[PDB]
Amino acid sequence: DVGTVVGIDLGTTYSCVGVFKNGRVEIIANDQGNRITPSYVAFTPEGERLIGDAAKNQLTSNPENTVFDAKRLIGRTWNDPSVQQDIKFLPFKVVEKKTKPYIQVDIGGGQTKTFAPEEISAMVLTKMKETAEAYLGKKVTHAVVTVPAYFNDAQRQATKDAGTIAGLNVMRIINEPTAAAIAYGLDKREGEKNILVFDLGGGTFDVSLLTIDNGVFEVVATNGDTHLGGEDFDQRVMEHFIKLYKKKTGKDVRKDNRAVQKLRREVEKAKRALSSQHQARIEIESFYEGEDFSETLTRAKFEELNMDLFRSTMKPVQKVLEDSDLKKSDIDEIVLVGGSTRIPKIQQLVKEFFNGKEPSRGINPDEAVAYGAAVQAGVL
């Protein structure tokens, strides 16, 4: 007996878990009340293992001992040009072991330890498992887990392996764009259609053209940018404010990880706020050298700081349509994934690109992939 099978979006920057019941999916809040959980692992100085919000939130002078973005490495070999590029921007040490990238961190006690990417992802899955168990009031042993459509056999197997290490039998690996389409019930309708999935996550941007034929999907064409996501918009804002603060005080806070962390947290919140407001006030008490930070960001300035990045999202979309020889009008459904898709300028670019067609709506775009996974888990 497989018990209650849950759906898990094991994401680059954030992860999400849901369960199907009573004709719908319940996206499950974690013990901090959040329906998404950072795909982060860190250690206290005393050697306590933190996963999720606690790991991301932990203020540190040593950023090199916080692990994230393990999905960028999972199932890849050390010599993969993708790995060799990615390790240049990751703050933690990645070392070759067994022809594979391993992650080396301080775990407390003047002890270091090396972890396979899949051991880090197993820790994230453990937290998502615990999240589900607390809600369901029973143990969870089986899951459907999502991956990017471009993942290869080794990457899909390494994801299953992460599941195994976490005590989860991953019954199905399903592609993220397909999961989002399932969330919106697109498999339950009659006829043949073309679906465009526009997925702007925290760290990666994926455009997928799917067909549906008699209720069954096919991933026909993919494109995107694995180094474009919500965090890049945050970084543009970070740079603006670090530069402003230096102009105002003569203080350069970039060498000071704790101040940078505090600013990044408030900038993430401001960005989300600017999807529904035209101004956001960023306030940090004791930001730097005990001095307070107080500045405002307008939606216009946010847009100005990111305009090239926003516009750059349309090129992969054009590439996918060209590759499939589809007119804009041939797209029967547009599915948005990621909270960055709620950014008004991104909505406007997508709407204008598609001649005013309205996307699917009704599911939080940060939750849609998990939602779909949970739908599929619901029949098992």
Binding site: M171, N175, T178, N214, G215, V216, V219, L380
Partner: protein, 41 residues
Amino acid sequence: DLRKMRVAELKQILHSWGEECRACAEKTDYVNLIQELAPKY
């Protein structure tokens, strides 16, 4: 061979065997199951 058929035809093959593709989101899932089940039927 299999990859060239319509989904309706893949479902037709499975239905005729009294076999179901449970939680099979994509055409590849139907192709894979028919290949695995073919020596039975």
